[PDB]
Symmetry: C2
Subunit: 412 residues, 2 copies
Amino acid sequence: SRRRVVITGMGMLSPLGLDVPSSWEGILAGRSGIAPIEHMDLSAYSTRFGGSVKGFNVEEYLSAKEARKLDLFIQYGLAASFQAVRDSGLEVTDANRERIGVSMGSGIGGLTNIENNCRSLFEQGPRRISPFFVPGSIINMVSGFLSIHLGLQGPNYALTTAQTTGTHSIGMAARNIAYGEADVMVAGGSEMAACGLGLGGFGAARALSTRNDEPTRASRPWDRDRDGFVLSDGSGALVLEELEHARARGARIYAELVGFGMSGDAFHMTAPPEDGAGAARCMKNALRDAGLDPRQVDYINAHGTSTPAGDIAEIAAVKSVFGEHAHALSMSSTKSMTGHLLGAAGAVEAIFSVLALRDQVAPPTINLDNPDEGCDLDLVAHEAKPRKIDVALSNSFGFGGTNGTLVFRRFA
Amino acid sequence: SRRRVVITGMGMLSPLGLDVPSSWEGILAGRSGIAPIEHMDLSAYSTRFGGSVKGFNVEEYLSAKEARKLDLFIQYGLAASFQAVRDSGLEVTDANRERIGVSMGSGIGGLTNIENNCRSLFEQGPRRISPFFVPGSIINMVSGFLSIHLGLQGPNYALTTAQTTGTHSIGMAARNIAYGEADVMVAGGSEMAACGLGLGGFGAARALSTRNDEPTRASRPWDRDRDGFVLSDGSGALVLEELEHARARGARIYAELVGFGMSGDAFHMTAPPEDGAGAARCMKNALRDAGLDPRQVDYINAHGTSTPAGDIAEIAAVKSVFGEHAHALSMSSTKSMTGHLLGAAGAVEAIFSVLALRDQVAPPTINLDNPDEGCDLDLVAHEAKPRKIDVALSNSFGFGGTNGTLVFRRFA
Ligand SMILES: COc1cccc2[nH]ccc12
């Protein structure tokens, strides 16, 4: 019979910091993590900036010998996972190791490593491909390497649902616990797509902002002068735990995960429908799953990518789901500051949604200077808004018309 | 309680055939699909052979223009999915489309596309990268494109658990239906890693058989002369359906999906533990999920990759789980004929497990000329074995120590 699921630990690498508290301080202060990319020569690229993780030290987590074998997206996923497990206070024992699993996903996975090995292959021959190429690059190896390091023998898997990955990963890990396949899951996502193929490939789709001369203002969700998403790196991980398991060990509980929705648009490979029909269907599923009145929703962490079609589709979906209550809730895009962490977006944004509940504050949508036609909700323009938040919703929408919604509420 | 899940449609591309009946005819005849890889200079490579899909015509499924946008692994996944939906007879309507979802996965995803776009990037720079590079290469686009083409609005996602992908996709899709989130799911996996990067990547780890002189004899699970797995391409898709839904429309039911097990080894990144402790937990989890005693199992489709460590771990696991029944069941590796389809292995082997139930026959382990030390189970050496099969297991054990088991039962 369906059990309740709470959040007992969180971990993060973002363009705003090397952990949760440092990231959250940047969020509440309206700070941009977006800057010209230093790690490669992008003079031939139409976009030369993004949200980099600054000063990441993998040797806070892993031996340099093991780190060298792993794509950055695996290193970021392990860092957030280790932080979340530590933050939980959970002790892994022979008694509980079979009941603790992991679902850390990625949208694109080890593109940097795949590019570097493709260069070796093409310039020098197959004998120069790394022996660690496959286990060092494939998406499931966050879950794999975390289980090996911590001794987690529960369900072990990874989702890849493009920009919806971190939201789906957390929702499905919550379903694992809810229906008794696990008592604890580490769940979230990680992404490092800032290589030639990543910036070049999104560039070739003309999906990215090209505001190279003012990167901190590039990400401007619902602003009339927005011109596409800002590519960002990092990771979010949460420890999800069955309520009575958490209560039994005296865990600190940040919030309860009460609702999860999925829906497919069945509309277009990359474009969202302008009326937000799939996102509305996904939110309604999530609110019904949480047994809520839609009027209980106080805060929405929007997908809010800063694309022309995506941002307006979300306003349409929120108006359609919430009717007059759409004018009472606060909705913000933290991508205004972090940029778009792709498969990690829904993981970091789930964490920001939990902290909005802990601290009773709506994070701002920075850069919202001139809201576009129809973008007339409370979008928390410019500055953080202290307010009552009992229920918070986090939305993600990705390529393939794939939608995810998570519903969190305060736990007393 | 929980709804029952049945299989009403199946679809496949494999090295044996461009559909299920052709593939299955090859399986029961002990035919190898392994041959030197064509239209590709493998001179500098230690492995020059594998399981290719032969004579695949994508214009049976897609326009030339839509096919040009999509990696081969996506093409293969869509072909299996379209076959499976056709085979099921299901009519998608406005009344059921929100209850029909997709979970089609891949282990490695778009290596061929990444490789071809690397060529362009290194030679000519980023402005030659295809606009469809990202959506045409990411793993969730089989689910994406299938949902868009057929108007499916149910749960839309993609698993990526390396060589466990197909088994986990089908199992979690079955959970979706059992727990009322969907009435129908298309589930399985696809793979096309026969590029420089895949042959090169696995070859650099010396994981592949190098028996270039006799490719049809390379894949020889539990044989003392085995020297690693054989890389293979293709796809499997199953239509999963709630039982009352299938009966109401007069669906042809192949078999019932009664159990799903997951575990993590938490042991090593690429190698299983010698005693198969993880594979044992996973099978026991699957049988407990099915409410079945190990004694009720009649047929196991092994993971059976032809690796020294992998094959012996599976013998140890089966002896551990099944005790005095270990010899009574039949266990075969269809990878002896198909090679190792990686993320699609669990999908095509779920189909062969269902057809073993339909036709009351254990497929052979071909090339099992000299069983290794302790390989003394009924491994169905050389030739198919007609026998009673009421309960059939399909196991996958992949990188990161990720395990999956599906339990299928005869339906009457
Ligand atoms: C039991 O585990 C699950 C995995 C995936 C999806 C699910 N929905 C309801 C339960 C469930």
